Amino acid sequence: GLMQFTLPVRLCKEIELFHFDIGPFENMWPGIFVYMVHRSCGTSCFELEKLCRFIMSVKKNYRRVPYHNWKHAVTVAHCMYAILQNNHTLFTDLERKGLLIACLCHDLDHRGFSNSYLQKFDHPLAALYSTSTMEQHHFSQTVSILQLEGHNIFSTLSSSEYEQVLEIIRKAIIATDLALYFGNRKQLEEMYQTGSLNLNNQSHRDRVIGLMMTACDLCSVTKLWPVTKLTANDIYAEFWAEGDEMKKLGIQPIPMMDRDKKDEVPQGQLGFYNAVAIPCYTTLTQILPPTEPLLKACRDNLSQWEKVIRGEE
Ligand SMILES: Cc1nn(-c2ccccn2)c2sc(NC(=O)c3ccccc3)cc12
Ligand SMILES: [Mg+2]
Ligand SMILES: [Zn+2]
């Protein structure tokens, strides 16, 4: 079992960095991901043929939408890989295995519509799960793919460890529901500052992994400016599509989702960086100091959106 995936020189160096961009070649993302699982985990932890059949089925079940697509899945996994590599000692053999699978599967079968739109459209999935509607759906789909033949990449685990790792993945994926983020971060801030944040508490680990999942999901805000700028077009194109479907139901959508209100994009990004992104990576850096590069890049992009409002670009 001496088959070590290697990346060309620039990628091999650049991939270790939080701000790495996985590039425009779809055909290299599976190799990128496997390279990350091997360095991150062990060459031992998964059987290559099962892994490769698991990854390809996950790709086939991501859809052709402007932002919540197979590129995004691999990007989020990459940022999780970077967090783990810079915090080597804090995570168990199970967490490292589970979390990179979580990140790849976190937006499985996403059609480009918020939980909110499912509720007002009255989509069946919203009948089955009242809160975190898409996030329970994503997990449901992960589990479906796990139970295909030749796809049980966790087959070498006891009954116990298997249940722990699937409960890591479930909590991980639920935590990508941003409505949950606000409370999760309020509570972590209050634990860190009253000195009670304790990582042996399974209750406290769950919340901290929940924060990493938010950090990894937002991580287009932590890239270099030209990648941040260009991903914004993809993000807004999903939002505008949904506002279009909102209007189709007889509902004026919020200005974020109204494509007649493009003028207000950079101001909307300010709001988001101030109200979400900066607080997210602020709190995460207090809990996990080696993630500071995420806060630095996030402030830089906040500063680059201020320059777009002031006419200097
Ligand atoms: C204005 C804007 N930019 N932007 C963005 C920028 C970079 C990367 C990802 N997202 C977001 S995400 C968001 N709000 C939610 O997704 C949401 C979901 C459920 C409940 C409440 C809010 C708003 C917003
Ligand atoms: Mg999602
Ligand atoms: Zn996502």
In sequence order, what DSSP letters do the residues of 283-301 get, joined into one string? HHHHH-GGGHHHHHHHHHH
N residues, the chain: 313
DSSP conformational letter for 97: H
Q: Does 286 show up as a binding residue in the annotation?
A: no
Of 139, 133, 215, nearest in space to 171 by CA? 139
Inter-residue contact 36 to 81 (CB < 8 Å):
yes
Distance in angstroms (rounded) separating the CA atoms of residues 125 and 133: 7
Of 263, 197, 265, 180, nearest in space to 231 by CA? 265
Residues in Cβ contact with 107 at an 8 Å cutoff, skipping those fewer than 6 apart = 62, 68, 72, 73, 76, 134, 138, 176
Radius of gyration of the chain (CA): 19
Nearest ligand to the CA of 73 is 3
Name the residue with the closest Cα to ligand 1, atom 21. 179
Inter-residue contact 103 to 76 (CB < 8 Å):
yes
* Domain ranges for the chain: 28-310
109: number of Cβ within 10 Å: 17
Residues in Cβ contact with 64 at an 8 Å cutoff, skipping those fewer than 6 apart = none
- Between the alpha carbon of residue 40 and those of residues 37, 153, 225, 266, the distances in Å are 5, 16, 27, 36
Q: Which tokens go with 167? A: 């409960």
Q: Which tokens go with 57? A: 């089925």
Residues with a known catalytic role: 68
Determine whether the shortest distance from the Cβ of 112 to ligand 1 is under 6 A.
no
Q: DSSP alpha helices (H): ranges in the chain?
A: 9-14, 29-41, 48-61, 70-85, 93-105, 115-121, 124-128, 133-146, 159-174, 178-193, 202-217, 225-248, 265-272, 278-287, 292-309
The SS3 of residue 86 is coil
Determine whether the shortest distance from the Cβ of 302 to ligand 1 is under 6 A.
no
Distance in angstroms (rounded) separating the CA atoms of residues 51 and 53: 6
Of 199, 183, 181, nearest in space to 287 by CA? 199
Determine whether the shortest distance from the Cβ of 79 to ligand 1 is under 6 A.
no
201-211 core/surface letters (b: 16 or more CB in 10 A; e: else): eeebbebbbbb
254: number of Cβ within 10 Å: 14
What superfamily in CATH does domain 28-310 come from? Answer: 3'5'-cyclic nucleotide phosphodiesterase, catalytic domain (1.10.1300.10)
Q: Does 244 show up as a binding residue in the annotation?
A: no
Residue 107 Cα to ligand 3 middle (Å)? 5
Determine whether the shortest distance from the Cβ of 221 to ligand 1 is under 6 A.
yes
Of 297, 309, 21, 248, nearest in space to 113 by CA? 248
Residue 256: its H or E element? none
Best probe residue, ligand 1, of 76, 229, 272 (max atoms within 8 Å of C-beta) = 272
Distance in angstroms (rounded) separating the CA atoms of residues 110 and 47: 28
